[PDB]
Amino acid sequence: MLKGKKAVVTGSTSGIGLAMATELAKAGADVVINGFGQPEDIERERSTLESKFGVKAYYLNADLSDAQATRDFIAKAAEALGGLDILVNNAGIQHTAPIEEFPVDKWNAIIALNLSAVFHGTAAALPIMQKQGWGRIINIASAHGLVASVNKSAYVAAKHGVVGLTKVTALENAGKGITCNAICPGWVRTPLVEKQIEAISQQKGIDIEAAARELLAEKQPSLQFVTPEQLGGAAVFLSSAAADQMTGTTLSLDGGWTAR
Amino acid sequence: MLKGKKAVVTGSTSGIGLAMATELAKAGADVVINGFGQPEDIERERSTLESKFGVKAYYLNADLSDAQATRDFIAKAAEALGGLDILVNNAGIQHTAPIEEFPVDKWNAIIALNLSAVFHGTAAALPIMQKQGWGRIINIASAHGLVASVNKSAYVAAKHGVVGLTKVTALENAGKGITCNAICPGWVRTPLVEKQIEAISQQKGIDIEAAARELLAEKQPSLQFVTPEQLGGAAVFLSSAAADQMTGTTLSLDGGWTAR
Amino acid sequence: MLKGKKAVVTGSTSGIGLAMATELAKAGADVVINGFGQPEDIERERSTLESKFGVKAYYLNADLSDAQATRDFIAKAAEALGGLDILVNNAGIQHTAPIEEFPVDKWNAIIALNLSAVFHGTAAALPIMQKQGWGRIINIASAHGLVASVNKSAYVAAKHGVVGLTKVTALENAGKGITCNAICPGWVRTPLVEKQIEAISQQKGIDIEAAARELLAEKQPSLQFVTPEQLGGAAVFLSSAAADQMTGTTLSLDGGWTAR
Amino acid sequence: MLKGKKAVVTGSTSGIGLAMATELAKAGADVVINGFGQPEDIERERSTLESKFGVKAYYLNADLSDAQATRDFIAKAAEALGGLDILVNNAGIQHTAPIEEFPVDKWNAIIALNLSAVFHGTAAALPIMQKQGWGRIINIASAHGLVASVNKSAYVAAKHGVVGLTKVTALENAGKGITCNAICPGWVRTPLVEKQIEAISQQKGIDIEAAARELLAEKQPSLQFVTPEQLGGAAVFLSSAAADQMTGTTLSLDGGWTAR
């Protein structure tokens, strides 16, 4: 249980980040959520965290592709919470194309959000954690932080970068009561992946669920998606005392992806 | 919670394995323990699991350096428990010397226990798990399954072997409800490590606690030992639903060892 | 021998890149060099390649922190050479500081040059190599593309990114006659490292050569620098037929850094 | 060129080891070959090395699954050569079956040859190299020393073990003029792989060359076999001065296998 803890989850209006926020709230943490979406949906999400789980929840809109906005977001989050114990750097985007066709603006956007925002968020959070002598920074990388696939140059580069940055963060704060680790999921059926399933279905001329099976079979030996709830559970484990000496490392929940 | 589950922990009369057995019993699992020691100590350990935690506990003496004894041990364990849900392949030994001086009998003994017993135990357990469509095989490797140190040829080879074997086990049983992962601890202050601290203290002419600090500083950026209780917690996480799609991978609790 | 081949080496006015250009010229390749420095030194370098080794050499000044300048540089290089067979993405910078103090402009500059320029250069080169059905892209990463050190967040992130990007490039061009690999040096005594030796010497109050020994001892088990000439040799190997099926991987010349 | 050098290649009567011996002889090294086969074929191989390449060649029959025979083989090899500069630990076998069906005798045989012989050969060679202050130990691991496939428990365990042992050897002899590295091939069309192609062809009901294409497509993005000649070239590179500070690491020639 994380009763009293103060958590921030970037990109928590959808997908994995939404489940992270839910699992941290369930465990007793106050939570700042963040990301894009319909205002009515986001306010329902925020108010739900409070009314279900009896914690405080805040939504702070910040486009984390901007460095100063990211650093300002962390300051505003810490002010809202009255502290900052757990930072989950989760927000991310995807774009698929071969390198020689890969849009320069998409490279920049993916590096900005998927890598640089992790740096800027970490930089802003660390002094708060260092002063209190406890912290968790939990970076959501990918199996694509450890291995590659075709047509994902920017994303694989960014996620490999996050895995490196995780190690540095850990080493710089070794022994201080602050850990930093990277959760490296395989496929999780969010909108980020549904777009890729749709693309396969159009390429192959097959129904969406046949396409989902093809997407899994290529990469993920279990032939089952990882769930957002499972990843929330992993984050709660990383936040626990059992993980006090788990730092600078990757926690792969990927159905066997990286085993082969 | 693991209520109803049936667990086997090899080398659980000391050190990490003893804490594993305790944490699994606390979670509600019946437990088979195993290993060498004083009969009075082992029976106190066994009876303690039952009287504290209200589970069934059995001690089965088997020297797991022998293949047939290991396979027979798993059969006897499953018979005692009435099943076998969770196998923790933990028993291990250490011997330090440079390669050209490394005793051939010590190479054989370390390979037999630290690697081959993991194969034989896994082979015996798998058909039981496959029939029921659920299982956890949790191999205790090391940071030395991922990187090396001097004067540990056999041990590093064995532990790298365990990490490879873990991946194969996972892949062969992908999707079946059975996962296999390797917990890779850094330094944990058990008798296996106390011998090495003592050796440093004699080499350097320093007290034992100064030697322990030197042993940590060389390898483990946090400058803190990993605890058996933390590793028990990791095993309980691996045994949980959150880890259903965690398979074929390493879970490093090593204070930053492998980050640098 | 690489007789007839057409090579481009970024950041080849100093250090490792200068030796790369020399070794490729020695092997018979025409070479485009690139980077900052004194005009008289750079023209001596260029004319030396021609007069010693009997190849054609061109200097193209381009600040590769700019995407369009990098893509334009590759076009101009290919025009000068009459082709483009081998691209060595080598230019890089360093800055050391803890994350919470790490200048945002230095993060941006290191990501721009050490990572993004590798993407932009690769993107520009690939269509030329794809049309001819042969190519080598040789990325100069680091041991810090595989592991981390303190106070090098941007650099470690970038170099991990390069290692990921290398894998994608390889996979996208698998079987086409084009390979992409990352050379991952340990310490090499260039100006990039001499600054860090100087910083250690000031911190510890020791002479420069004692500081160099300390810098090695921390990271590099051989206690010897890797040389630019050795790395040139590695590049010539990667460019050879023996390495036709070496692709998507790292070639560590690091004196044992990543073994422990 | 390796003129004057004295090399030993285990399992060099077939496949990769035969090409290793050839490439080392071409470079000017005297060579000891080893392995099973028809006496007339082996003597033709031995005499061919001498008559083509003008070096001395010796065949020493030793079953390297036996520790003492392996240590005695190295002594006899060094006596024949008048030294020992380069040891290539190459001999290996394969057997495919799921873990719960995997013959205990095959596990033992694969561990004995593919792992333990590397230890025993290294142990015997090292004192010779240490006395002269120069050496190369080149271990032939596999992509299966880094990742896994189904039905190869023993082999993957052994090859992961070799990769670990390589690191220890390197670290123990860091700075001494002795390096140790592991060449990690992907598929190479030797008899060891032809058996597996034949098995696929029977399973799928397809001709042998269609089966070979299937075997490649599953694992090896280039869709081309690695050749024994390429691997010989890699060994000659590792034996060169350019590789003086390459130690404790893996050299993957695997057509992209480990990139994804």
Ligand SMILES: NC(=O)c1ccc[n+]([C@@H]2O[C@H](COP(=O)([O-])OP(=O)(O)OC[C@H]3O[C@@H](n4cnc5c(N)ncnc54)[C@H](O)[C@@H]3O)[C@@H](O)[C@H]2O)c1
């Ligand atoms: N889905 C998968 O299979 C998978 C696998 C591995 C890793 N990941 C990673 O998990 C993380 C979450 O991905 P997801 O699958 O839940 O995707 P998603 O698209 O469902 O959610 C992305 C979240 O990020 C937010 N967001 C996007 N751009 C933003 C910006 N500029 N600033 C602030 N917030 C922003 C979105 O509004 C949303 O809340 C990403 O880092 C992704 O790379 C996903």
Ligand SMILES: NC(=O)c1ccc[n+]([C@@H]2O[C@H](COP(=O)([O-])OP(=O)(O)OC[C@H]3O[C@@H](n4cnc5c(N)ncnc54)[C@H](O)[C@@H]3O)[C@@H](O)[C@H]2O)c1
């Ligand atoms: N202590 C550390 O720092 C550390 C770090 C990483 C991994 N490990 C691993 O953790 C595992 C447990 O080690 P530990 O530190 O608790 O050591 P330990 O010596 O305290 O415990 C070893 C256990 O194995 C048992 N055992 C020994 N030989 C046996 C045999 N032939 N058959 C059956 N049981 C046998 C012992 O009786 C004991 O119960 C080992 O695999 C070790 O390699 C330990």
Ligand SMILES: NC(=O)c1ccc[n+]([C@@H]2O[C@H](COP(=O)([O-])OP(=O)(O)OC[C@H]3O[C@@H](n4cnc5c(N)ncnc54)[C@H](O)[C@@H]3O)[C@@H](O)[C@H]2O)c1
């Ligand atoms: N020196 C080491 O120990 C070491 C170790 C591992 C990797 N590396 C890598 O090797 C590569 C070369 O480093 P080095 O040690 O030779 O450093 P160096 O400073 O000697 O050389 C850097 C080169 O890059 C050029 N350069 C710098 N900024 C540039 C820009 N914006 N555009 C174009 N060119 C630019 C410089 O003019 C110079 O030619 C770098 O990528 C570095 O990260 C170095």
Ligand SMILES: NC(=O)c1ccc[n+]([C@@H]2O[C@H](COP(=O)([O-])OP(=O)(O)OC[C@H]3O[C@@H](n4cnc5c(N)ncnc54)[C@H](O)[C@@H]3O)[C@@H](O)[C@H]2O)c1
């Ligand atoms: N072929 C591949 O695709 C591939 C890929 C990666 C690694 N490897 C490795 O390359 C090495 C050589 O394999 P190969 O494909 O050339 O196989 P191969 O069967 O063609 O050659 C094996 C060699 O080892 C010898 N040998 C076998 N048992 C022996 C024993 N007990 N003592 C002494 N010598 C013995 C054989 O006589 C033969 O000379 C092996 O270690 C193998 O694991 C092969």
Ligand SMILES: [Cl-]
């Ligand atoms: Cl792919």
Ligand SMILES: [Cl-]
């Ligand atoms: Cl060491």
Ligand SMILES: [Cl-]
């Ligand atoms: Cl460090």
Ligand SMILES: [Cl-]
């Ligand atoms: Cl497989």
Ligand code: NA
């Ligand atoms: Na892989």
Ligand code: NA
């Ligand atoms: Na390391």
